[PDB]
Symmetry: D2
Subunit: 388 residues, 4 copies
């Protein structure tokens, strides 16, 4: 009963994950830099489907158009030699000191304009490489103090930036969509569009809402103590789940970027159950960092672990849903009634329905148990492979 991934599983990794050198706020790098070409080859051997990148991961910042073309060619050759795809790309608008107060929402106008040009340049490259989704993580859009940022003006600037990107994409006739990646904090004290909900609401104010979706990350929502599977269901409900970032996080603290499966294991189970049940067909992207305690063999073991854990959880969720005893427990808990309209009969009928109020036996209804604990223990038994 093994769990070997194949490119058909659509597992992708960012170059910066497996390529993280181990530098954290309190320590120096513990691993040497990885050549993107090497990463592509190693990931392909592990069974990955593709890779993603920030412009600066692929092309060192400040590169000449000559070196730039050279880095792209090398990368292209690696993709051709392995069959790896690049379904998503993004811009690095957070590392360089110039973005210390943000990219799209920097107080300095000239920085905002530079941010847009840097993004547009990489959008062209993304399309050339076949990316279908372009992610935007405003890691520097935010503040550490209240008067440093008028949030209403910042949201005006954020909308202006995304509206312009939408105009560019449309004018070039590109077949690419945007996904906003929310995060509540870190590296800024508080970051704008802190959760999936804030990002969804913001999108509805853009000129062309259909071009934008969300790219939620497990750890990000968990940094706000939120239920990740619940947030993903809302994004799916709105038809906005364009991409997803998978990793592990142990509660409310710094962003750990643990391999997927680590952190909140039951939440990972419920997330996989939802993604598979809902038919999500986008990439299963891992944005994680192999701990700095590891050498390169630990890096690859960590990456393989991500995929393995997703596949084990997929098997367990499928068995849970396919179990007749579980199907009967779902009915006992009335999940079937939850899916039925409350009043398909209409408003007037509801108002005239005496069984809905005047003659409703509130005490009999209140005495009915939901049987949620037995259902949950069945879910637990399935997760642990203890069904008998």
């Amino acid at each position: 009963m093994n769990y070997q991934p194949t490119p058909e599983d659509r597992f992708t990794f960012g170059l910066w994950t497996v390529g993280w050198q181990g530098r954290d706020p309190f320590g120096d790098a513990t691993r040497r830099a990885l050549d993107p070409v090497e990463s592509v080859r190693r990931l392909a051997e592990l069974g990955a489907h593709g890779v993603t990148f920030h412009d600066d991961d692929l092309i060192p910042f400040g590169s000449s158009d000559s070196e730039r073309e050279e880095h792209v060619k090398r990368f292209r050759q690696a993709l051709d030699d392995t069959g790896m795809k690049v379904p998503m790309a993004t811009t690095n608008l957070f590392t360089h000191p110039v973005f210390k107060d943000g990219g799209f929402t920097a107080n300095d106008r000239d920085v905002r304009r530079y941010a847009l040009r840097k993004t547009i340049r990489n959008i062209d490259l993304a399309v050339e490489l076949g990316a279908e989704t372009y992610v935007a993580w405003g890691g520097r859009e935010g503040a550490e103090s209240g008067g440093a940022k008028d949030v209403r003006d910042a949201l005006d600037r954020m909308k202006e930036a995304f509206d312009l990107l939408g105009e560019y994409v449309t004018s070039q006739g590109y077949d690419i969509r945007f996904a906003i990646e929310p995060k509540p904090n870190e590296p800024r004290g508080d970051i704008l569009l802190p959760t999936v909900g804030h990002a969804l609401a913001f999108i509805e104010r853009l000129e062309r809402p259909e071009l934008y979706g969300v790219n939620p990350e497990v750890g990000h929502e968990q940094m706000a103590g939120l239920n990740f599977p619940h947030g993903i269901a809302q994004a799916l409900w709105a038809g906005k789940l364009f991409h997803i970032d998978l990793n592990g996080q142990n509660g409310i603290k710094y962003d750990q970027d643990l391999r997927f499966g680590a952190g909140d294991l039951r939440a990972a189970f419920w997330l996989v159950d939802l993604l598979e049940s809902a038919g999500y067909s986008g990439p299963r992207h891992f944005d994680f960092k192999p701990p700095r305690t590891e050498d390169f063999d630990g890096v690859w073991a960590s990456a393989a672990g991500c995929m393995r854990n997703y596949l084990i959880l997929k098997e367990r969720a499928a068995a849970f849903r396919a179990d007749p005893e579980v199907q009967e427990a779902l009915r006992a808990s009335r999940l079937d009634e939850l899916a039925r309209p409350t009043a398909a009969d209409g408003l007037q009928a509801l108002l005239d329905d005496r069984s809905a109020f005047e003659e409703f036996d509130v005490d009999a209804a209140a005495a009915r148990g939901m049987a949620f604990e037995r259902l949950d223990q069945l879910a637990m038994d399935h997760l642990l492979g203890a069904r008998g």
Copy 2:
């Protein structure tokens, strides 16, 4: 330099705040019940503008149409004798055991129908009493376990419920709007529409979005570690801040419901600054609980404290914004540039602008300090009244 409130300040209190008996999950009541009429009179003496209520605060659950009319008449007389208004009303869809799995999203269909009828009945009463806003806090809409609730179906049921309420209001020609009150958790393990952002996004999927807004609470957003003033700015930006609940909370833990001003004091300062700067003209409603350590004299002192703290903060925020030294610091930090469009010149102009990329001096821009610390210390000095 005192701070006496007057009804013109629009401070309102829920009957259940000052009327909280002190029963918590680990202890019995420490105070006797308050007659709503008494609360109305005491609050009027303190300078309040009005009160709010859940149907069950005013009319004991299970009351006959006869007793019901009697309770309303008494309340009306109290309002007439004091000049107090009732700008907001809401339904109690959380106390009675029948709502143990929710009201609008209960798995049991018959409960959902009952929830709608109970709400509609109180909407009629709210209009009669002159309420302009009707709040909905789905405290029981949620779960403690993953399989107990299919969130996509629950959101379908939530939309159905709000859509029906919107149809009812329109058909009756009522001049009343709805405000959804989000909360991340408690009493449920996780509650649906957990933050202001989730509520805003949800509203955009309703049939008549213009009839719905949000009713955010200080403590609620802080339970998710979020920046309350930031969330309020987004709601204002979207034009959805129909009402607001003020209180105090010390971090991520159970909902404390401390008096306004307590908890995160600087966040309270920044919230007041924003509300006043943006011209919010709705009620300043306090949803708090005087601690159970207090007797009735402590209850009124706690209520008076809420208003006093808001007025002190209002004075300090106004002085901060009116201070020429602060106005110069805002310019030094480029808040003025944040308010200017990034590219009013248009996309094509931006693409052709060499100063935006090809000739942009990234190192000179990066070296500019934001001067945010001096600005923040000026804000601190103003808050503490230490300006000299």
Copy 3:
């Protein structure tokens, strides 16, 4: 491969767990009261070893010495008829309004004296029933505001109370030990002795430290975002783990009291691994609350779930430790070197050892991978029963 508990497993339950009526801060009870005798019989059928109680769970507050003797006799008969033991007892110094500001640390002296007499009376009863451990949870010792409690004076009062209890126990020649149960908050804004560490440190200042230990609870430490297994290891290291409370908690929020196994599943695995490896022989006590969504059948299913989950985890931890591949991975990660003294050779030898500094190759040491990710994936595979 089933998991049936037997009294030999030492699983115990508090009368108040399975007996919780479902009253929370926002709702009324959803279940009728359970007769303690009924609980004893039902728990015995499920395979429990014993029960625990607060004085007020067994004897209604304010009972006459006559009724008191009657309640005890009935309970005794239930214990005799089932073979159930009562290894731990505690006092309720939190429900009654008189303890609104605490028991042992109430500002009112007369309340503190009453608290001690109420405790002493139940200590006598506990010994009579054969309890070996007496737990103290100061749920009301704390504050919501800074000036309400001088913490240094409160700690003086806390020590005075425990010192007197120690004097009483010694003078009566009782064979019973005390266990302090820490909690960071709820129902008070902040509670004194908030974590296992604070409780351990406090104990070292008591007159007879050997009579006191800690009674940590999974959910409590997790409310402060702490690693429960780590805290338990420190308590074991100090030889102070006299008792332990098991349950489930999903992060930093109100105390959920979910059944054991729910909440942080991996932390539960690591806790069981530690308890079994260290040879903890005290009771495996469950302090949890079956959710108020449940009827009585759900209550018993929830209680059975606690025991089942502990037994599944025990099996998985044992297999993990017994796996030769894991034993080799532990060596690869140098857990064996962690157990060896750093300098059994002594200070002077260390100072004279050139290989420890002057000739130590810091770069070669730094390049060694810890191989922690492979080890953790082996732990994950074992937990999920995916070893192959």
Copy 4:
């Protein structure tokens, strides 16, 4: 009414605070390195009393004994030219890749030995420079996964390390004490001795407990959602507050290191009140980082802000305690009774005292209000300078 600091105020700064270049996990440095000599001179001009250092801040890692003597001489001359003192020093056992799994608790024995030699070398230097306290922050002592560290063995290694350091200090006849600095997490997933309480408890197991105390940091305890003033009171109660680190933190998230006064303002007020009331005479040390948005002028403004905020709070706390109306409110809330022994009359007298149980009127006692809200509003008015 200004607030100018003077060296008599005992404000100290770590070289690494004002010297932080701005490199965070997601970005490069935004400021050039500061020469320690320059920092000493700038801080002296601002009114600081002294500075502190990690060995590696003063002497670049890997320096020859020649360069080492050169760096120390330059530093000494700066101290002599300014009158600045160096009351505390510490070791950097976290930056270099060799400490990726810890220093004192690394699984590799050779690393642990190296850690001790590096520490001992800097202890000699600290004494030479006149430091009275030697701090130890085990930032790398911990783990990201459960099987990576046996906590009981790690605590054995931790005790061994501190015991050896204590033996060294005693054998050299040095007049210096150690202070353990706890932190719950970051950079490790979970760090050993996570809070003040854990550190206090650990100290009681050392061979010479009198040589060790704690060095708590505002932000650290707040990362676990704990009440900092409460933790400081316990450390004072135990006589273990040897040093203290001041800064600002906004809730549970990454360690922000905001200037003191920022973050939780009311907690800062209560901390200052306690330190001054208790007569703490050690340094008021600031371990903070001026945000990376700032240039050098912002760095000095941020440092000056720390001192200014402490002095404003000191003034407000003193006025609060000196206010007769507050003194009467303290009596109304019975803070005076909290300071009186519960039973100086002894155990037997308490048992025979019928007014303590048999004849105690529990209902009359329960009805007494604590008057805590009025007291807290008086504290608020004083903090805000709104007393009239």
